[PDB]
Amino acid sequence: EIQLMHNLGKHLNSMERVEWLRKKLQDVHNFVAL
């Protein structure tokens, strides 16, 4: 439950990874919040 869980975010795929990494910083912080 530590390496396998880390492999989910470590996997992704370049653009889906970056848009994901950028979405993580702005998670519910764009739609209506901050």
UniProtKB/Swiss-Prot annotation:
Changing L21A: Strongly reduced affinity for PTH1R. It comes from the Eukaryota. Coiled coil: none annotated. It is found in: Secreted. Residues 17-34 are annotated as: Important for receptor binding. Changing L25A: Strongly reduced affinity for PTH1R. Interacts with PTH1R (via N-terminal extracellular domain). Parathyroid hormone elevates calcium level by dissolving the salts in bone and preventing their renal excretion. Acts by binding to its receptor, PTH1R, activating G protein-coupled receptor signaling. Stimulates [1-14C]-2-deoxy-D-glucose (2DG) transport and glycogen synthesis in osteoblastic cells. Belongs to the parathyroid hormone family. It is linked to Hypoparathyroidism, familial isolated, 1: A form of hypoparathyroidism, a disorder characterized by hypocalcemia and hyperphosphatemia due to a deficiency of parathyroid hormone. Clinical features include seizures, tetany and cramps. FIH1 inheritance can be autosomal dominant or recessive. This is Parathyroid hormone. The chain holds residues 35 to 68 of 115 of the full protein.
